[PDB]
């Protein structure tokens, strides 16, 4: 069960991160929101109750994550679940011959810094906090869940920067799982498809929802939260990328 | 000095083995009274001859020097550079007579230490020779007695003294201490000990033993009156630990002799080898004969004052301590032997099959060995019983009488009376060396049986005359017991050399009842002869001896009833047989079949062969094989082929081992 567990959710002030926070707190767990101060996460933390605490920090900055982790340890005393639902996206073709446009290097670096560099920055820091926990009778110390979109396998036109960042997370999920296996930490990656997040939200949405084989609708963030809970409860789930897409194969 | 010294009784004085001791030491080995068959007995019981420095002979007599030639050719093949003999001064003349029939023996070196020579000392023992002359250059009244004194040994330093002495332990300073304490001294400056008695073992004084030979009552008084004996007997100077007596029991019961032994002291032991021993000497021979007797009893008949009677392998330690060891005493039990034979994988069924299937002259094969005596086969010898009252010996090898005595037991005296003539074929050793033993025993048997001493008839090459003449003139009177006939005078084309020779051969024909006697020159060596006997009954027996396939033998022995032929080698080494002037198995078979004899027998098997020869498919109902102490009659010819399966079963393992060795030799030859 997830009763009494303490979880740290990056970017949990909106989108997929908030949905997992709502479910875990409702099930009886405690959550810490880790997202930029401009997102107004303190309003969501107050709404969810006394079990939710907003920690203003930036994933790309080492100092901010360490400060937020110390706040979580001070408030609750331990960290058991780490969910990385933070990440930005950009849309720009690599090269447009007709328009004479070339992809800017700053845009590629900025996306890589948040999606990939930020995710690894969090993982390497929470594990240090996560390593001090007394082993569970099953030998487990905690669960770390990442989020890389389905673009890591099938990118679209102009989705080169997004696919590269998401592709790195999928590739690196196995070495990290092997890295933390002796200390007893499980690392998993979820591959959501088209989800009703603010990042995705009119004619395009209806067409994209119709392109999903079944169900022919956009993803529900509540369903994403359900999959996260299933991974936490199952002790044999490790080192896999799960496509929460709906059997949709993306076209150019 | 040596740390252990003990004696051993190789032969316990029995009539068929004589008496012999064996002194063992870490530095030297000694032998006493090397008689006939001593070489075979010592080899059987695994007695090494590598360092046999000295051999002591107590009396110039054939009962003590009979096996001397065999030991000499053996030590030589052993590689010993020099051997020293001790005893009567006649040994030098005896050694000269040995070279008549043997070679010069250039390899080994011979030395003689007579009693008149100065005393001899060794690294382990000092030996004194005592010449004794009986009451009333050949000398027939000299007997030498030996008194052996061991060297005094030091005493070990008491190593536990290191807790009290001031000497630096584990250093070189022990060497002057060792030179002091072991010699009875002590370095008092290292402490207070002025003598080794405080820290060293008491040195052991030398313990002496005496070997005394008293062949007859005539020697009793000279032994008693000897002053040199009184030096050790009536004194406390190292009382003699043990005295070995080799004298007949009639001598022992004499009061003067009884008082002589008792004067040596109460602690002195007394060991006696006086022909009263009851001990089996040839265990392997007894084992095989008992096993073969289980097949056919007739073809393989069965064989036959405090003091300590000697036994085979009896021991007595002298240097470590002084006890009657008695640990390797032989034990003869026919029940164990038959159990081992019956438990053989194929012996039981084979003899069962043969048994459920179901007179003069008779032949007894005393020995079927070629060159050296072995555990199972003695040197060549064959006895023929023409009539219940007459017999003929076909070859007299070394120790032949010993085998004869074992075969007949107490009946040997009667058998020797029936001995009419002895035939010697070619003058190699181990073919004639046993003759003096037969003659002396024959004289004793005739005296015991109460018969006139008529000289025996001997058919042999003229070269044998010189050998016996020199021995008779120099060492001991023999020639007055025989009337020798040259072998050449009995040839088919021979001529009467002298009327006395014609008179003797006529006497031989009358004595043996033979119709005719013939000889021929076989191709083995210079003056090598065969033989053939025809009886008035009509049966003919042909003996070849050492030879090669020859035509004169075939012509002379035509239509023989039974043929005995040499089978030294097999078909594998026919080249060696030609080089060594011997015949192979198939060569003998071919010669016999060409001669058209009713039956064929083989003997003179090589030392390469251990127990049985190779049974080639050419072995027909006429071809047989010979073993020691087997009896063959003319009615047993059809039975002989039937015995092949049981003999194969009784010797399955060794023939497999022999076949395996031959296969490996062939493989090595091919791969060479």
């Amino acid at each position: 069960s997830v009763k009494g567990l303490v979880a740290v959710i990056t970017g949990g002030a909106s989108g997929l991160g908030l949905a997992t926070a709502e479910r875990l707190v409702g099930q009886g767990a405690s959550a810490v929101l880790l997202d930029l101060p401009n997102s107004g996460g303190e309003a969501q933390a107050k709404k969810l109750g006394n079990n939710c605490v907003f920690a203003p920090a930036d994933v790309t900055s080492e100092k901010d994550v360490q400060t937020a982790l110390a706040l979580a340890k001070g408030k609750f005393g331990r960290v058991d679940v780490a969910v990385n639902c933070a990440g930005i996206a950009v849309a720009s073709k690599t090269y447009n011959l007709k328009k004479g446009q070339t992809h800017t290097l700053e845009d590629f670096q900025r996306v890589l810094d948040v999606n990939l560099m930020g995710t690894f920055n969090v993982i390497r820091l929470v594990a240090g906090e996560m390593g001090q926990n007394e082993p569970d009778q099953g030998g487990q110390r905690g669960v770390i869940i990442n989020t890389a979109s389905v673009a890591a396998f099938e990118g679209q036109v102009g989705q080169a920067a997004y696919s590269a960042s998401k592709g790195g997370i999928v590739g690196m999920t196995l070495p990290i799982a092997r890295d933390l296996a002796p200390i007893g930490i499980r690392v998993m990656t979820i591959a959501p498809g088209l989800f009703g997040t603010p990042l995705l939200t009119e004619k395009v949405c209806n067409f994209l929802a119709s392109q999903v084989p079944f169900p022919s609708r956009l993803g529900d963030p509540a369903e994403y939260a359900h999959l996260v809970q299933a991974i936490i409860e199952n002790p044999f789930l490790n080192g896999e990328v799960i496509r929460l897409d709906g059997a949709i194969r993306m076209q150019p | 000095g040596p740390n252990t010294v003990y004696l051993q009784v190789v032969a316990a004085g029995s009539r068929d083995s004589g008496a012999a001791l064996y002194v063992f030491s870490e530095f030297n080995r000694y032998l006493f009274n090397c008689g006939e068959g001593v070489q075979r007995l010592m080899q059987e019981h695994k007695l090494k001859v590598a360092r046999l420095d000295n051999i002591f002979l107590t009396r110039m007599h054939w009962s003590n020097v009979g096996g001397l030639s065999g030991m000499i050719l053996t030590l030589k093949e052993t590689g010993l550079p020099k051997c020293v003999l001790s005893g009567p001064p006649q040994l030098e003349k005896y050694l000269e007579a040995i070279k008549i029939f043997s070679g010069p023996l250039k390899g080994i070196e011979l030395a003689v230490r007579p009693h008149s020579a100065p005393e001899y000392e060794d690294e382990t023992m000092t030996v004194y020779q005592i010449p004794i002359h009986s009451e009333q250059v050949r000398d027939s009244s000299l007997v030498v007695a030996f008194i052996c004194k061991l060297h005094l040994k030091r005493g070990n330093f008491l190593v536990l003294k290191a807790k009290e002495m001031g000497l630096p332990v584990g250093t070189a300073a022990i060497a002057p201490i060792i030179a002091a304490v072991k010699d009875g001294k002590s370095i008092t400056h290292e402490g207070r000990e002025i003598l080794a008695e405080e820290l060293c073992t008491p040195p052991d004084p030398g313990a002496a033993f005496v070997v005394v030979e008293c062949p007859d009552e005539s020697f009793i008084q000279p032994i008693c009156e000897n002053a040199t004996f009184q030096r050790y007997q009536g004194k406390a100077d190292a009382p003699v630990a043990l005295v070995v007596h080799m004298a007949p029991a009639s001598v022992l019961v004499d009061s003067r002799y009884q008082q002589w032994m008792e004067r040596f002291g109460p602690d002195t032991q007394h060991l006696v080898l006086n022909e009263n021993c009851a001990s089996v000497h040839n265990l392997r021979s007894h084992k095989i004969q008992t096993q073969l007797n289980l097949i056919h009893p007739d073809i393989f008949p069965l064989l036959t004052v405090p003091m300590v009677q000697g036994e085979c392998l009896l021991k007595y330690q002298l240097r470590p301590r002084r006890e009657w060891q008695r640990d390797a005493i032989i034990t003869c039990n026919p029940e164990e032997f038959i159990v081992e034979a019956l438990q053989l994988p194929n012996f039981q069924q084979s003899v069962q099959e043969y048994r459920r299937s179901a007179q003069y002259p008779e032949i007894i094969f005393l020995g079927t060995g070629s060159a050296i005596p072995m555990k199972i086969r003695n040197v060549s010898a064959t006895l023929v019983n023409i009539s219940p009252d007459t017999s003929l010996l076909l070859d007299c090898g070394e120790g032949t009488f010993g085998q004869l005595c074992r075969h007949y037991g107490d009946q040997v005296d009667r058998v020797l009376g029936t001995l009419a003539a002895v035939f010697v074929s070619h003058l190699h050793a181990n073919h004639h060396t046993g003759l003096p033993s037969i003659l002396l025993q024959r004289e004793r048997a005739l005296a015991s049986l109460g018969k006139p001493l008529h000289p025996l008839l001997v058919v042999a090459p003229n070269q044998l005359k010189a050998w016996l003449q020199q021995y008779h003139n120099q060492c001991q009177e023999v020639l007055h017991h025989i009337s020798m006939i040259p072998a050449k005078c009995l040839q088919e084309g021979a001529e009467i050399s002298s009327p006395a020779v014609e008179r003797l051969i006529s006497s031989l024909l009358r004595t043996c009842d033979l119709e005719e006697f013939q000889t021929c020159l076989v191709r083995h060596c210079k003056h090598a002869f065969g033989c053939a006997l025809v009886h008035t009954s009509g049966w003919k027996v042909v003996y070849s001896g050492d030879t090669m396939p020859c035509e004169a033998l075939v012509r002379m022995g035509k239509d023989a009833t039974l043929l005995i032929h040499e089978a030294t080698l097999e078909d594998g080494l026919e080249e060696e047989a030609v080089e060594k002037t011997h015949s192979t198995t198939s060569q003998a078979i071919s010669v016999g079949m060409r001669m058209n004899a009713e039956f064929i027998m083989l003997n003179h098997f090589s030392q390469r062969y251990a127990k049985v020869p190779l049974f080639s498919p050419n072995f027909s109902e006429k071809v047989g094989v010979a073993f020691d102490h087997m009896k063959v009659c003319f009615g047993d010819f059809p039975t002989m082929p039937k015995l092949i399966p049981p003999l194969k079963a009784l010797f399955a393992g060794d023939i497999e081992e022999m076949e395996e060795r031959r296969e490996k030799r062939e493989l090595r030859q091919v791969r060479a």
Partner: protein
Amino acid sequence: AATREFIEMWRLLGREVPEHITEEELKTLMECVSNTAKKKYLKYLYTKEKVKKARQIKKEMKAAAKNFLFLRLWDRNMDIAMGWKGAQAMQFGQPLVFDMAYENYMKRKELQNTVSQLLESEGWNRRNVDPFHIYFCNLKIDGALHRELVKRYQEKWDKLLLTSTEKSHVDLFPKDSIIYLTADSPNVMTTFRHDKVYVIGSFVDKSMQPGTSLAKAKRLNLATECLPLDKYLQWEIGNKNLTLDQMIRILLCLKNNGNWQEALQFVPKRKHTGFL
């Protein structure tokens, strides 16, 4: 305990005796009835102390002393890879049988040497590219050999990738496909056969009693073979019996398509003048 002085004084004399002694080996010392056995036992203890003390000085001598693709974690990786190969060999590898029926004929000294050779033989098989499927037949539980084996391997005994059983070779394989290797066999091994099962007797036999393995094989009517040592190399000195480690290395070379002149490289050079 009279042993105390018996020795201390010999230690003072320095007559090749151990510097110290323990209780358990002292009881074994008084369980030796012959002075030669005690002398040999004391020399065995004496040389054990000297080699132990001499090798200690080597530690004192040793005390006087970017971009990378991988981490130095190699002893683990080699062990894991050899484990994976062994696991596959336990399913598809060619069986090889070590017969432990010779426990009766071995004294304590030979029993320890048998275990040491078995440890070496198993190690060589593990490192091979195509390992065998090592069987330990007739291994009686709580026996002298079994107790020694679990002592040397400690916890590894339960994890070694080999089949250990109390049954016999005949009870696990068809009698036709079994070949009992021995030096006394009349048949000469010509070529390695991949369809057969080879049995190697776990024997040392210093006090030579030849024919023990041959008698055991003939008792069950099993085929026998002897390595063709003489045919390929010229023998000079030494018994033709070979150690277990040498035998398994010879078989491994033959199993891997090697020729006889290459397999026999593991025979000690102190017996064969050279090849033919």
